[PDB]
Amino acid sequence: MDFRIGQGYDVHQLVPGRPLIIGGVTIPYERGLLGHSDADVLLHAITDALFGAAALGDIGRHFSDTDPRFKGADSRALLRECASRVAQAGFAIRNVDSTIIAQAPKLAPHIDAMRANIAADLDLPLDRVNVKAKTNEKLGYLGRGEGIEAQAAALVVRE
Amino acid sequence: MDFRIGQGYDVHQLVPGRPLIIGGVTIPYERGLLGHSDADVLLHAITDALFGAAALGDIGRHFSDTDPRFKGADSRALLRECASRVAQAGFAIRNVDSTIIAQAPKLAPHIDAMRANIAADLDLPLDRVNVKAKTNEKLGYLGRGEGIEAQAAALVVRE
Amino acid sequence: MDFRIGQGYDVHQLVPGRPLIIGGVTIPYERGLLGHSDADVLLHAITDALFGAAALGDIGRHFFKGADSRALLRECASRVAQAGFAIRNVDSTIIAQAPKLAPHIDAMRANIAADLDLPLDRVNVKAKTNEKLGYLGRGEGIEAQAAALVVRE
Numbered sequence: 001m002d003f004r005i006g007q008g009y010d011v012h013q014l015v016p017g018r019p020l021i022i023g024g025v026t027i028p029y030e031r032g033l034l035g036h037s038d039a040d041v042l043l044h045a046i047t048d049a050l051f052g053a054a055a056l057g058d059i060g061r062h063f064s065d066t067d068p069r070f071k072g073a074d075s076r077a078l079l080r081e082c083a084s085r086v087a088q089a090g091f092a093i094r095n096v097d098s099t100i101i102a103q104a105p106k107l108a109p110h111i112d113a114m115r116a117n118i119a120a121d122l123d124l125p126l127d128r129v130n131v132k133a134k135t136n137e138k139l140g141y142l143g144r145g146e147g148i149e150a151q152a153a154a155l156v157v158r159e
Numbered sequence: 160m161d162f163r164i165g166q167g168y169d170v171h172q173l174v175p176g177r178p179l180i181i182g183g184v185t186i187p188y189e190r191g192l193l194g195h196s197d198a199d200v201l202l203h204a205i206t207d208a209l210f211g212a213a214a215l216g217d218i219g220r221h222f223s224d225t226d227p228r229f230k231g232a233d234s235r236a237l238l239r240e241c242a243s244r245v246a247q248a249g250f251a252i253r254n255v256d257s258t259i260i261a262q263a264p265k266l267a268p269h270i271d272a273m274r275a276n277i278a279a280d281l282d283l284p285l286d287r288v289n290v291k292a293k294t295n296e297k298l299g300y301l302g303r304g305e306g307i308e309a310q311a312a313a314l315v316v317r318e
Numbered sequence: 319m320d321f322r323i324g325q326g327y328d329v330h331q332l333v334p335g336r337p338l339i340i341g342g343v344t345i346p347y348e349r350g351l352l353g354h355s356d357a358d359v360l361l362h363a364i365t366d367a368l369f370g371a372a373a374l375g376d377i378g379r380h381f382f383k384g385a386d387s388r389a390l391l392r393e394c395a396s397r398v399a400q401a402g403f404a405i406r407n408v409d410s411t412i413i414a415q416a417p418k419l420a421p422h423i424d425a426m427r428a429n430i431a432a433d434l435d436l437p438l439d440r441v442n443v444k445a446k447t448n449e450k451l452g453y454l455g456r457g458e459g460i461e462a463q464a465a466a467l468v469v470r471e
């Protein structure tokens with residue numbers, strides 16, 4: 001079978017005055033991620049991994065910060081559109097795995113919520129979607145709570 | 160043909176007065192990795208990739224870091240238990256790849272032994288396990304030798 | 319059948335007096351990447367993902383004195399084939415605050431596809447800034463990440 005792998009990366013700054021939205025989940029916190037709309041670092045990484053697996057460029061090439069069509073779209077809408085494009089390219093999604101690196105707050109309570117959102121948007125069984133969380137052991141801008149990173153891996157198959 | 164992919168990340172601080180244990184190998188060195196377990200950054204990354212590929216969460220979910228057994232835990236025993244759970248979930252491991260990023264010490268003399276340990280723990284032949292090493296080209300906290308990072312990828316198949 | 323995955327990481331410092339070469343594309347810029355070779359961070363990450371997927375070690379284990387990174391990528395492909403593997407696809411991300419990489423990405427894909435003897439639609443290259451965070455965000459270096467899938471025939 002015609003399997004393909006994709007990989008994704010994203011990072012945003014963490015500062016007072018924005019809400020924290022990760023994997024479609026709003027998470028209580030003094031601070032939030034700085035970005036164009038919701039700055040959903042996990043959904044962006046996943047979107048990138050899916051475009052990558054399909055060899056369709058990247059998230060910024062499909063959904064520009066300038067495009068009127070996506071001006072007020074949230075990252076779940078973008079993820080859904082991504083999934084439609086991957087489908088039309090001939091690919092079925094097999095699984096997604098991911099890691100959020102955040103020194104704080106605790107993400108574990110929210111993991112099943114994120115998985116549920118992602119599986120819904122990709123039309124995948126829940127057991128094909130995984131999200132993991134790591135601290136940076138107090139190293140670097142991640143370790144000082146200055147930003148949050150997401151990594152993603154996706155496997156697809158041409159059908 | 161039900162393939163799944165997983166990815167993992169880990170980093171630990173490098174501090175005096177600790178054994179340096181990476182990939183299960185005790186490496187002569189004046190500093191070691193800081194953590195509650197033996198802090199084996201490579202094995203944790205691989206363990207997370209395997210749980211990720213099976214959609215079984217992450218290492219914190221499976222091995223509570225406040226269990227007395229976690230203190231000084233042999234990360235190879237953790238990796239073997241991870242493999243047991245992944246098998247119990249119905250998955251067979253096809254391959255593992257990984258990268259260690261460290262300014263020092265020189266890892267090359269130890270890499271084959273790490274490979275052999277991981278292959279043993281996962282009941283894989285050597286030719287399905289790979290460990291790569293990198294410096295960070297003098298950049299950042301890794302370039303300053305403040306910690307060591309590992310990255311891992313795993314492919315599994317649900318039987 | 320007998321599929322394998324690999325993953326690769328590279329980073330190089332940005333320094334004056336060097337051309338900036340990424341994915342085989344020379345990009346106008348005041349600085350370039352520092353390395354023994356031409357320091358093509360993207361090609362190095364893909365090279366390591368390919369050796370990793372074939373369980374052949376890493377780029378430092380294999381590597382030529384004045385060779386550029388495309389010759390090394392071609393040699394990597396040769397060694398991957400020698401071990402009995404065929405390449406199925408490559409995906410990657412370049413993390414650079416500057417310069418703008420958009421105009422150059424399709425050319426990088428074409429270069430990699432030619433070097434790996436792959437059709438264009440099995441090769442992908444993505445780009446990201448680091449949101450002004452860390453050494454990447456300060457423009458002190460450029461990182462690349464890669465993933466490769468191969469099959470043992």
Ligand SMILES: Nc1ccn([C@@H]2O[C@H](CO)[C@@H](O)[C@H]2O)c(=O)n1
Pocket residue numbers: 058059060061414415416417418419420421444445446447
């Ligand atoms: N140094 C960089 C970094 C990113 N990019 C492109 O910008 C869009 C948003 O990340 C993406 O489409 C990405 O390709 C770029 O052209 N140059």
Ligand SMILES: Nc1ccn([C@@H]2O[C@H](CO)[C@@H](O)[C@H]2O)c(=O)n1
Pocket residue numbers: 101102103104105106107108109133134135217218219220224
């Ligand atoms: N921001 C974070 C970071 C980590 N975690 C969980 O804590 C375990 C060890 O860091 C991790 O393995 C993960 O289980 C979390 O819930 N939220």
Ligand SMILES: Nc1ccn([C@@H]2O[C@H](CO)[C@@H](O)[C@H]2O)c(=O)n1
Pocket residue numbers: 260261262263264265266267268291292293294376377378379
């Ligand atoms: N701390 C490190 C980092 C890297 N290396 C080896 O040097 C070569 C160049 O990355 C690679 O072959 C790598 O294995 C090492 O021996 N120890």
Ligand SMILES: OCc1ccccc1-c1cccs1
Pocket residue numbers: 221222223224226228229232233236237240
């Ligand atoms: O059961 C796996 C295991 C093997 C060896 C040592 C500790 C454990 C832990 C159990 C819970 C936290 S660590």
Ligand SMILES: [Cl-]
Pocket residue numbers: 261262294295296297298301302303
């Ligand atoms: Cl270094």
Ligand SMILES: [K+]
Pocket residue numbers: none
């Ligand atoms: K990183």
Ligand SMILES: [Zn+2]
Pocket residue numbers: 010011012035039040041044
């Ligand atoms: Zn983003």
Ligand SMILES: [Zn+2]
Pocket residue numbers: 169170171194198199200203204
């Ligand atoms: Zn660890």
Ligand SMILES: [Zn+2]
Pocket residue numbers: 328329330353357358359362363
């Ligand atoms: Zn390099």
